[PDB]
């Protein structure tokens, strides 16, 4: 990433690991080491991010915001 | 929320989101993005919510409390 | 407790909330609001209790040691 | 260990406490208290680990990576 990874790591169902980072992205990575996508807030993260029954991601930013993404990593919504 | 979202979230048997933030709330979000309710305390919340077996919501606050909040939103206890 | 709780609670099987304080403690509270025991350690607790499979409790501190403390609250061992 | 505990620890399948520290390192602890290794970062590990469906061990540091240790305390892979 490109900040301190404050923020601490989830495992999804297929072993995608989801964390954000200091510089205001949430991370989604392969078991491989391979980047899936990356979804940018408007500050650091902070906060760890936790997964639904659905395979939601769940994360809080500096921003204020409380962020919703699909698993593709496409915004849901956010608080 | 009204304030960074430095707390991480935790998902309920129903979906809802608990998290803290600096604004001194526990916000209790819907899986639809819809606020559910929230339970301010005296200090920023730091801390991230866990949840019990009967569906109890545990957090901490910088106002040196361990709140208990019912999933209906009303105070259980804090110690 | 006695200062900010930053920490993150953990539920052991019998409901018992686990939660460090910045006030040094590491507390252990029923799910009836009462306390059950507190340890204290030479910094404050900022980290977030775990339990392992034996329902030992496994939490940090601010005094560089990761503390084992059995669930009466004693202490196993620290690192 | 040789810094401040503020990372959350990681109990594994076996029992084994993974905990990362503020000394830079990331701590792999026997449930008898006694070191299994420790894996060396850039920077100061306040994020808390996670343990995916295999073993591995993910963690991010202050130096802007996210760590994935094998349970034998070898780099498998840095993002």
Redesign the interface.
Known sequence: ???????????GQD?T?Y?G?N?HYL?A?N???K?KWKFETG?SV?????????G?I?????????Y?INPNGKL????
Chains 1, 2, 3, 4 share one sequence.
């Open positions: 990433t490109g900040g301190s990874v404050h923020s601490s790591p989830a495992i072993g690991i964390v980072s510089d991370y990575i078991p491989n080491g980047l500050g902070h906060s760890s991010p936790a997964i639904g029954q659905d939601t769940y994360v809080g930013s500096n921003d204020h915001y409380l919703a849901k919504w956010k608080f």
